[model samples]
Target: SISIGIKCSPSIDLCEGQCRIRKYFTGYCSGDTCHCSG
Candidate 1:
């Protein structure tokens, strides 16, 4: 298992924070988790 710990400046919305992972997501971040077809 591979785990990564990231520290980010708090944002007004969680969506914005998780959106940072967009590059890793096939689609977009949804429901507090990065949503992708995979």
Candidate 2:
């Protein structure tokens, strides 16, 4: 068996520090982790 359906995370912050340091931001919730590094 395999998965076919797709889902996205939640990103409700747009006016905070986490949204300023980076040029973009994404929300994750579907059993996935996301982050940024230098």
Candidate 3:
């Protein structure tokens, strides 16, 4: 298993489900700015 961390330039709202704000993550996009690894 690998642990990764990312910081979004601008935090996005997870409830809205929009990329209105710049975001960064470890793996893949789940919803909004959320990320998950596989």
Candidate 4:
């Protein structure tokens, strides 16, 4: 998994949630960047 190059404009919680479902991994917001972890 990796950063999906997505911004946290909508919301960090929302962004990470989307990534978690799409990437099937733990997603987090590093400050304001969305990053996914394996």
Candidate 5:
């Protein structure tokens, strides 16, 4: 068995900050996690 995925802890706000600081083009919350894309 294998598990592969991202899980954002706490809230979506955390993702937002990360995206901004990292200077990603976009950042969003997936089904159960956060994602950043350039």
Candidate 6:
């Protein structure tokens, strides 16, 4: 099955793991500005 991926930005809380925020379609906590992918 396929589901819609969640998206987030630096302005928003993209908590993928701890302080890391999802890069729109990903996760991490080691970057100033994350990127969003489709």
The numbered model that scores best in TM-score is: 4
* Better-scoring candidate (TM-score), 2 or 4: 4
**Candidate 4 vs candidate 5: which has greater TM-score?**
4
For model 4 the local lDDT of residue 18 reads 65
RMSD of each: 6.9, 10.3, 9.0, 2.9, 6.3, 9.0
Report every candidate's CA lDDT. Answer: 0.34, 0.32, 0.32, 0.68, 0.56, 0.36
Q: Which candidate would rank higher by TM-score, 3 or 4?
A: 4
- Model 1 pairs in collision: none
- lDDT tens digits by residue: candidate 2, 1-38: 12212332436422323333554343223343333223
The residue pairs that clash in candidate 5, if any, are: none
Model 4 lDDT tens row, 1-38:
57777766535365658687885467766667777776
lDDT of 6 at 25: 44
Pairs clashing in candidate 2? none
Q: How far is candidate 5 from the true structure (C-alpha RMSD, Å)?
A: 6.3
By TM-score, the candidates rank as 4, 5, 1, 6, 2, 3
Model 5 C-alpha lDDT per residue in residues 1-38, reported as the tens digit of each score:
11123466646436655665667665666666667776
Sort by lDDT, top down from the best: 4, 5, 6, 1, 2, 3
Better of 1 and 6 by lDDT: 6
TM-score against truth, every candidate: 0.24, 0.19, 0.19, 0.53, 0.44, 0.22
TM-score of 5: 0.44
What tens-digit string does per-residue lDDT give for candidate 6 at 1-38?
11124343545645343223432444432234333333
Cα TM-score of candidate 2: 0.19
State the lDDT at 9 in candidate 2. Answer: 41
Candidate 5, lDDT over the whole model? 0.56
lDDT per residue as tens, model 3, 1-38? 12223332234524222222333233433332334333
Which portions of model 1 show Cα errors greater than 4 Å?
Answer: 1-25
